[PDB]
Amino acid sequence: IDGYFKIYSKHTPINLVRDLPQGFSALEPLVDLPIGINITRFQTLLALH
């Protein structure tokens, strides 16, 4: 928004088959960057071979 698009992250062990546990996940800001331009939509990226 305010010109700063900020990224957050975390890494957690999970023993469950798929879905999420009851624990809390705290995410620190990685980098606070001057972005300015808004994004209408998105999609993820992939690595294939």
């Binding site: 620190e28 800001p29 980098v31 606070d32």
Partner: protein
């Protein structure tokens, strides 16, 4: 009577052990009053009083 990167205040600047997150600027306190600051020219965590 200090000015840090446009932040003005008058206090006793000391060394301090409280540890910022890197992107952060001001430490604060329960009263929202400025408490700890980070010296821009060399990053160090200064108290106030």
């Amino acid at each position: 009577n200090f000015n840090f990167n446009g932040l003005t205040g008058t206090g006793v600047l000391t060394e301090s052990n409280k540890k910022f997150l890197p992107f952060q600027q001001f430490g604060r306190d329960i009263a929202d009053t400025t408490d700890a600051v980070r010296d821009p020219q060399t990053l160090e965590i200064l108290d106030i009083t």
